[PDB]
Symmetry: C4
């Protein structure tokens, strides 16, 4: 069944997203989530829903940890959602995005890359658009510099406090089935 990864720096909102979208958590409650220290493999198995697996990662996985066979993980992955906290400085997020998608694409160029520009409830509508544009351009420029123009990133403006996170996650799922 399709496997979707949730990756991104600590505090970007990965666990909140899976809890709100798939486990009926109120967004307000997500403030009390513990920081994630083990990969959590969430089987969306209910007989009425599309069936797929979501892997909620600890933020900022260490690609040098020999416990983690990232190549094997990526070869079995249909989509990688990279979550960026739009309310915070995102230069490190952009660096880690690049490292992550370049490693994934090299082993599975059929993977879909989905960038959630997240926590946008804290931004004005115009600033959401400017933030997406800056992220889009910087991320694509980094890809171009590395000879990875053919690696396509899709961008989404998301918040757990409205419909947008559900719409975004649904678009990601629908591409895989």
């Amino acid at each position: 069944k399709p496997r979707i990864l949730l990756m991104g720096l600590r505090r970007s909102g990965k666990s909140s997203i899976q809890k709100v979208v798939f486990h009926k958590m109120s967004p307000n409650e997500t403030l009390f989530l513990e920081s994630t220290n083990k990969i959590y493999k969430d089987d969306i198995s209910n007989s009425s829903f599309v069936n797929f697996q979501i892997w909620d990662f600890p933020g900022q996985m260490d690609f040098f940890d020999p416990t983690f066979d990232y190549e094997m993980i990526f070869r079995g992955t249909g989509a990688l959602i990279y979550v960026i906290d739009a309310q915070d400085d995102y230069m490190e997020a952009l660096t880690r995005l690049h490292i992550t998608v370049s490693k994934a694409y090299k082993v599975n160029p059929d993977m879909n890359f989905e960038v959630f520009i997240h926590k946008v409830d804290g931004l004005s509508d115009d600033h959401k658009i400017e933030t997406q544009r800056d992220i889009h351009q910087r991320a694509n420029d980094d890809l171009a510099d590395a000879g990875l123009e053919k690696l396509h990133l899709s961008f989404y403006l998301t918040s757990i406090y409205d419909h947008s996170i559900f719409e975004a996650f649904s678009k990601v799922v629908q591409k895989l089935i």
Copy 2:
């Protein structure tokens, strides 16, 4: 006990309607519903509610599939709700509506025919009214051409994102008890 069918093209919103109205699903969650591949017979049995059965059909049932005795099904049916996605082109929906209600009426002319012009949260109020008028007129004209003027269609403007789907489904139930 009364039997109500949910029919309509794939993606019209049948399963969403039954989940939101009768199973406490958030409308946002319905984005992740699987396409329905078997008739689901939902017994509304709770001791505090009106008791009736809802049959959630796969979209666009094949009237030529010999596994399905539609005449027998219709003879035991009190109401047929035909769901139309108002945000999409509805010419095929209108064709299939006509085929469906004409077949049902021929075996059970006491059946109530209930047309949910659905997903109206994506329409302006004026466009909702124009869409209902166009559907109403086209559907009635098709009935007239087939000599089925006495077959009455009732029309409802519905969305899972507000009270309207509950109000509509309640009106359908109340007519049967």
Copy 3:
């Protein structure tokens, strides 16, 4: 423990009130409630809540049914909530209110009489006030004519679609503890 009765004509909203306030029912779902045909004794027993019993009656109890010892019921009752559908004609409701409270007061003049002018979500704010005034004056005039000036009615404007039903029911409970 305190006993509170819910009485009123059929369809006034008695069962909706108890379901929404004490059983987490969405107001939208109450459209599908069956008409009540037996007294339902609801023990509010949760260890965190005030403990009391709510008796949800069939609408328009028959005072002439010899199965029902209304005097005994009233002698054990702390408050009687009489629910009136504000969206409907309320002349019969006023007649039945009078009959009900006069019978109750005669056996238990310590009972509290609480009139919920209900379903006010369908009224303008000014019309809510005029409706309460008309009900208040008519009900008190009927009491005066019967020599029951000392029987006090309290009036509340309520809806299951907002905080008002909770506020009203809380006021009734607080008077008893």
Copy 4:
């Protein structure tokens, strides 16, 4: 694991806060909470949340009751949340706040003192600010008079009817981990 106390006069909203934030209670339902007569020790233990213990106290603990070793309790306490009903007169609340934090600080000067100026949904925004200022100044002046300038109070404007209670409680938790 961190221990957080909820203290404050009766009816200030302590139990409502813990129920709404940590037990999915609707704010409307909190109207029916019983007055608390025993300390309730609530272990926030879910494997996805920060793990800590909340002690919901009866309002206005009696420091002279020999059943209660307040010094021992305070020595094991990371934060003390003192809840003040902003809609009510708060002179007694301020007196009891002072007594409480001075006793706590004397045995555990590392404790965090968190004052929730609560029920602010009943105040205008400007009156919220003036109420916080008056409470802040009066509380600090009392500390200064007692030679307790180094005892720091943090102030929060909270309501169970919006995000503010969640935000406030989250800030308190985050300071402890």
